[PDB]
Amino acid sequence: TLNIPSIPPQSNSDSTTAGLPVNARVPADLVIVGDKLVFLEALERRVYQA
Amino acid sequence: QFEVQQPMIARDGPHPVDQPVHNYMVKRIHKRSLSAAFAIASEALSLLS
Asked: Where does this one sit in the cell (chain B)?
């Protein structure tokens, strides 16, 4: 009864390690609307172009 | 001489695959010239002698 009564609804993910913490500083516009920040992007020049 | 390549999109569905396309454009060089008028009097030549 010390350890069995443990069924937590959560991410858990014990003993895991992934993802580069450094990440990338990429140029991308962000907009605040309502109360949330959102990407607002209009891809046509870097794709579907030429 | 310019060689230009054109990006494409990997696609699917009821379409056969499309081939990437090169284009090799050449333009011939156009030649031109300009000139202007510049006159010298005779007595100047006389003095240069």
From this structure: Virion; Host nucleus
Nearest C-alpha in B relative to A49? B7
Compare all CA atoms of chain A with the CA of B21 and give the residue at the minimum distance. Answer: A50
Residue whose pair of structure tokens reads 């202007």 in the numeric block: B36
Resolution of the solved structure (Å): 4.5
Type of residue numbered A41 = E
d(CA B29, CA B33): 13
Cβ-count burial B28-47 (b if 16+ within 10 Å, e if not)? eeeeeeeeeeeeeeeeeeee
- For A9, B36, B38, B47, the CA distances from B42, given in Å and listed in that order, are 108, 20, 13, 9
Gap between the Cα atoms of A39 and A28, Å rounded: 8
